[PDB]
């Protein structure tokens, strides 16, 4: 009588398990640690609340903390992010998890809600593990007798990192975060080559649109601008690339994109005349890679070419205008996770109406909402970068400090570069990579260790 | 009636002048800064000893910081970079040249030393710009007392920056640096988009050799490894990657190259039962990208399949063991900078005979020795952090510095984020690229000013 | 009370509809034909035997047949190639369907004889459209008498055009059939761009996993194998190709893959010593692309790494010796289209063997298996050449021809180039291309007529 | 005493004689053919008039023709197409060649008419091998009685075979030809992948532009097109396409390229109204790939973006209106084969005008013409059918037949694709690819010969 869950469908749990051990043998660097630590039990007393996308690759997280020796409260960090097989595999393994695919918000707070509370008191938690930083802003906003007690945030995403950023500039963060972002086996993989994957797996599963020989407009080229405008381009679109960061327009135009603006001169002054309606009157999709605000607003979504798919792979919906296609347009839906947006009017629409939009995913994270997010492999290194930090933070014991000695470890750090390496080397093992080791001669020469670290902290790769 | 230079032909000079003014209008960044800093003549009283590639765009360079109020003495950093019509045409607006394309070891050091001594005696310089640590080298050890009168370095390349923090960490640098490799804008543009362009280009200069469905293999895959292996797989060639350090070797695994070693494990014992000559016996071409040492020895030279191309990208000719070749095997000239290494061994060699390799540029930067180096649009940005790296430590003025002061103020920096967007937008403008600029909502929601700069020093583009 | 067809569940109808709507609008070509020959219904009378993918897409065709004039009954050419709402949507059209994904071989043969027989006797069929030559085969074998009154066949396929081809050179073809696979606008697009497009779609979905950085065999560089080598190249894949055809082989190595065969010098003399047991140890994906019988073969599948994924792209799952693995391995269902067969034994498996295979759709065609088949724009081109085909072959009346007539007109033709470039020409305006009109005196020069056709029948494109 | 030659420096032999010996490694299918027909002496008798590119890999095909046993009189077939040290290479070997690079128009035909005369008087010829057809025309028109005793023309180029159709058509024709374009191990190898390589480094040589980032425009998408697109696509240019063949228009836009037409809505009647200049003030590079006369004309050249380059890689330079600029325009040489046309007026120009397009060549065959043409393992596969042909039109002897058996001989005709396999296993071989063989089970299920062919005649690979 294990009842602390709620999921989809308990009977998807055969076929959870299935791809659980599918998954595994993609996953060298977090069935290494599994194998390595298995015997120290390094998580031993604790007591993980979680919050990221509760996918099959997630599930393998999941039950490497829980092989250390943690216990674990779960849900999924996004309403549409959740394979109910994977949830539903955890749950039968004894481990209490709040996801499902196609949440509601009010749904989405309860889950957060129920890894917070058992037995309708707060949990005996003592780390987090979050993504995108909705647990932490509610542990710090309505449970901060629960941070006394917590050792650390392990954050995964760039947007949640911001917001420990914030905290912490305000003085308003009361437990360390490692920075799991940007350890290079997470940004470079996760961010960049995951979206690689991803991101046409997505538009395909969503529309199954040709996409050679049409043209994307790219909203950013950060890491996911990056691996999202390759993407596309591999399967021959014509891409264009904005940004508002010269640095990151340089490297698009090296790469061989068109580096355009919505606005005429990149002037965004809020008004309809300085859309570009030329331009994107000629774009089939539009992506949204921002992590910023209103990136695709009102005036151009009213401009898109007929028919234009819309969607987001920054981790939140408001990258999109949504809140003003709601009010003004007519959804329809085609199937889960995929709408037309009519243009015609707010009050029913024309079955063949020819002026709509594609929405992917209501504007929510597309790789995961219209598809499953990264491959294993990818995933693999992102997640051994969590166990290191979930690791490393319980070991240093914050929570049982002193004021004074608080104060010095108060920080949003990153895991060291040898870490980073090892992590590397087993993902490089796994495509069957034979990394070459340094004569002593040629380690002098160079200036390091035979065994690493190989390069400066201030090198970009 | 100008004496005071030395180039192959003056008769070169107006040919060069042609290919400067087009050369100019490819680089905006470094004619932007012309057209800014004419009138201030911020670089009036420099005094400029320059040792970098004697190439066209070095002459945009040369004639920007004369522009700009500095006298200068050049000479080229390799025996095989210069373009006698660019030395030519700095010769002939009466700039003091010493460099000439095939230079002799003892020609390279007379060269270093015509810029040096000026009518017999130290000349009054009070500046140095450096490419690879040769010129700083030489002053340290030889003209000490000529470093007391001079304010700083601007140190271009991987390299040369090794080098001076070298002395920093032993105490024996003299004088104030500014790395400019590591400016965004000089590493991504020069060290990797650079090598995409120049070394498939050096290669058919030099081979006129199919590459599409060839095996290569690119030892490293730092910034020239992941240009110089692009620049290969982009023609169609099946590209092999080693690395020592595992996480370049992730992203070459993840950028679709299979990873080996040149050795059995990975590892080098010195003995020709290490090699791995089944693999080495499939390679059609080698590019060493490493700034190390013996990275293509002696036992794989002797492993490679017959006929293969040999080159380096990296900045001294010892990556490759050419000493060996030099001793043991027989040198055929097809034409300049290209020889047929006879491996029937040390003395004659048959025109007919089939067992030889193909060495460009007697291992010497390919890129530079087999065709031009990187076009103009590339050394833009890499000149332009060139000039204010110059025009930043000049008005910093060390040598006029107090002895407490000087303590203070030496060191090896960087320049500022905002200097490296500022060249980057002019970059963008080249391409006709247009940057959008933030809204005053959206700069407070990612926490950063409308004007920039945009990311965090740690941020890894 | 329309009853006439047997579908998974009528319930889809209205989602099927929805994704109608959408395809319409990918689909110039197609609908273009509508817009056409709407008012002249040169279709009126004909009685068309349907067996192609009951797809969205085919479903495009099927009511561009109806909406011409003609009526018809549906089966699909593959058990696991329908989309159940596309189905739904036909049958709630009052259009006999008989199709559902997951058909046994028994279901299989039942659909097609149920559009043959309406109400237990022979229906008056005189339109023949076939992909693959399945219905071809059981009218020829089964029905002879009803061939007496059929006008033509339209051949969609390579393997289909082969089993025409045959049956002509033996005197046993009994109707004149189209050769639609030969038309540009259907060999080009389709058989190659096509698998492009959905090889790697299938992979991702049936899978999951990273293909960037891994090892796939191809075997076959036809039009599917060039087109599906690119799918996997262009992930990041190291694509290595098989072929028996030395001039296919000359391309691969020019497109920049090695070639290789799984047999030691490429002879496969059935003994497990000619397994080249290196090379298929090494391999992560085997896909195969021939039409040709037994070129994944037992020993072959002996020899395949473990954990391997195994899938087929051409028109029979023999290809793949599927009945080996039936006989001698246990079948792990991961979910539907996707087994872990387990080289273990027969009669069970652990549920954590590390020793198994995973095959994608049992074997057959993977891309409509295990996705949705090519994508609506792609598939335009191939079924506007169908329209033009089955309107050509129902005018020229062959069955009411007299017998001298009749001996003339039994051959298997292809469209003429002028119709093919009318195709090509509405493909290209739903990518907003503009094609340049000649001039007289350019025409003149080339020797062409402004209005086409622009090449002679020889020309390869 | 050999004189019986014109060469730019008969002192570069040994240079051209080095690079014959490496060219030689690098070509199996040529090589193979000296091997396989030295001792049977084929073209014993033989006395061929060879009119094609005078570049070291024409060198290996003069030398195997010679080596079975031909001599030969050789000119080139383009004004700069020559490599000085080849033609010196050739001399030297005693035989006759009337070729360098940068012939005057009047030198060109001086150089035909040596060939055709020795002594003063028609030579013994029997054989003709052409490329582009300006020799076929000169004998038909200027020395028919010497046509009476020639058994065949071999002929190279698209250009060269429309000529002979049309002397066909018109029965002009006077011998035989073997259209050695429409192998497939010419015209894929050739004509397409040729241009990959060869363009990208023609530019490059020529003007050192870094193509990354910038915008091309290419006029065609035939094979030469195709290979051209993609050269500049994979240095991560913009490519947009013209076409007038809407079957190659559709290629382009499947292969992800943006079809666009210099004229509005593809409408030339020549105003300067009817030019699209919004597209062409925008390209900052043309490349004329089409075999037709004045497809970049006066009034494209006029609203060409200030400071394109602009080529031709089609046989002939009137693709490009050279003859108004020559008129109007103001033509500063920068170096050999690369000028600045100065917009500004015919007379003199300012040295700082910015007002300039960059021709290359002269608009002469820029592969050729600012390169060395394609690599010698592509030409291989050309000249090998170059060979074949010869061998088989000289041993056919159509000269010595009787009228009416001539009758029936005289034709334009291709190579069996026997022999075009055969030229191409040799070419798969040189990559170290490996052919599997079929087994007979899996050769009667395809209905071929384990031995070949393969295909079909109307196959089109
Ligand atoms: N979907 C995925 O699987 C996935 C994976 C990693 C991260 N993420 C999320 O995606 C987002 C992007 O992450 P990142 O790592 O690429 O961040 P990043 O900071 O590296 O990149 C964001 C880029 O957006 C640009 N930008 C900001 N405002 C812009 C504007 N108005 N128009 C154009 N460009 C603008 C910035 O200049 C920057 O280069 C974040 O929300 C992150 O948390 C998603
Ligand atoms: N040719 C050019 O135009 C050009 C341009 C920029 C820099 N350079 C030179 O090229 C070299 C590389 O510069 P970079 O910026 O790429 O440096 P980097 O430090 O970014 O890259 C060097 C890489 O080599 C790897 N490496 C070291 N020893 C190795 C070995 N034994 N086997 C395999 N891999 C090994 C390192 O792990 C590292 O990733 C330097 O000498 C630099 O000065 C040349
Ligand atoms: N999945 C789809 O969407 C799709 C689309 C079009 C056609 N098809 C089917 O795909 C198959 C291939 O069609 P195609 O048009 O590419 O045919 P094709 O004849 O152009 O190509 C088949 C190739 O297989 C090669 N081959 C044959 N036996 C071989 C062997 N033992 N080993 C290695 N290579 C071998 C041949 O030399 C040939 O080049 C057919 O069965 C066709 O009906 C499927
Ligand atoms: N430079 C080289 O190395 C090389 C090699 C082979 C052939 N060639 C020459 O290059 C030319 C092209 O040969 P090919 O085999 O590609 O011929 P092709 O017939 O295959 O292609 C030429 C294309 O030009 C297109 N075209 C014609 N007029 C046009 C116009 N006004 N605008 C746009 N497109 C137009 C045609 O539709 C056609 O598709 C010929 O002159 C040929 O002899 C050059
Ligand atoms: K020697």
Redesign the interface.
């Known amino acids: 009588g294990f009842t602390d869950y709620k999921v989809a469908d308990i009977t998807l749990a055969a ?1 959870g398990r ?2 659980l ?2 998954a595994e ?2 996953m060298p660097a977090l069935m290494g640690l599994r194998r390595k630590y298995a015997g120290q039990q390094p998580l031993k007393g604790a007591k993980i609340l979680g919050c990221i996308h509760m996918t ?1 690759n997630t599930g393998v997280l999941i039950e490497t903390l829980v092989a250390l020796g943690a216990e674990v409260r779960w849900s999924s960090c996004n309403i549409f992010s959740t394979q109910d097989q994977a949830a539903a595999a955890i749950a039968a393994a004894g481990i209490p998890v709040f996801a499902w695919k196609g949440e509601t918000e009010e749904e989405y707070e309860w889950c957060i809600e129920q890894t917070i509370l058992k037995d309708g008191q707060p949990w005996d938690a003592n780390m987090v593990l979050d993504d995108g930083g909705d647990l932490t802003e509610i542990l710090h906003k309505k449970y901060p007798q629960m941070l006394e007690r917590i050792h650390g945030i392990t954050e995964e995403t760039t947007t949640g990192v ?1 917001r420990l ?2 905290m912490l500039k305000n003085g308003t963060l009361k437990v360390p975060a490692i920075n799991v972002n ?1 350890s ?2 997470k ?3 996760d961010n960049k ?1 995951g979206c ?2 991803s991101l046409n ?1 997505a538009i ?2 969503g529309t ?8 994307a407009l790219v909203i950013g080229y950060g890491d996911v601008g990056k691996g999202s405008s390759q993407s596309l ?6 891409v264009k690339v ?22 005429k ?4 002054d ?1 008004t309809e005349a300085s859309i570009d309606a030329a331009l994107l009157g ?1 774009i089939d999709l539009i992506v949204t890679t ?6 695709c607003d009102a005036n151009m979504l009213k401009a898109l070419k007929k ?1 234009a798919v819309v969607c987001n792979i920054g981790h939140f919906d408001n990258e999109i205008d949504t809140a003003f296609m709601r009010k003004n347009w007519a959804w ?1 839906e ?2 889960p996770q995929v709408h ?1 947006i009519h243009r015609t009017g707010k009050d029913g629409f024309d ?2 109406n ?1 002026d709509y939009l ?1 929405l992917l995913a209501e504007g929510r994270l597309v790789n995961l909402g219209n ?2 997010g990264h ?4 995933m693999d ?1 992102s997640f051994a970068n969590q166990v290191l930090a979930q690791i490393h933070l319980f070991e240093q014991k914050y929570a049982d400090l002193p004021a004074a000695e608080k104060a010095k470890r108060l920080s949003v750090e990153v895991l060291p570069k040898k870490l ?3 992590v ?2 087993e ?2 093992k796994g ?9 002593p ?2 380690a002098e ?3 390091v260790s035979v065994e ?1 670290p ?2 400066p902290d ?1 090198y ?2």
């Open positions: 076929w299935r791809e051990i599918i043998s993609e099959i911001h950023l914030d940007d290079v086996t940004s470079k993989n080559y690689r994957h797996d395909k599963r199954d649109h040709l996409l050679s020989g049409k043209q381009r591999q399967e021959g679109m014509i904005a940004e508002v960061d010269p640095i990151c327009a340089m490297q698009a135009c090296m790469d061989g994109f068109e580096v355009v603006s919505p606005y001169n990149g002037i965004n809020g000629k921002t992590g910023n605000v209103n990136v028919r329809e085609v199937k037309k079955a063949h020819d594609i598809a499953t491959p294993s492999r990818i290194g980073d390496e090892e590397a080397l993902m490089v495509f069957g990579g034979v990394v070459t080791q340094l004569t001669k040629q020469y160079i200036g690493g190989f390069k201030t970009r790769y």
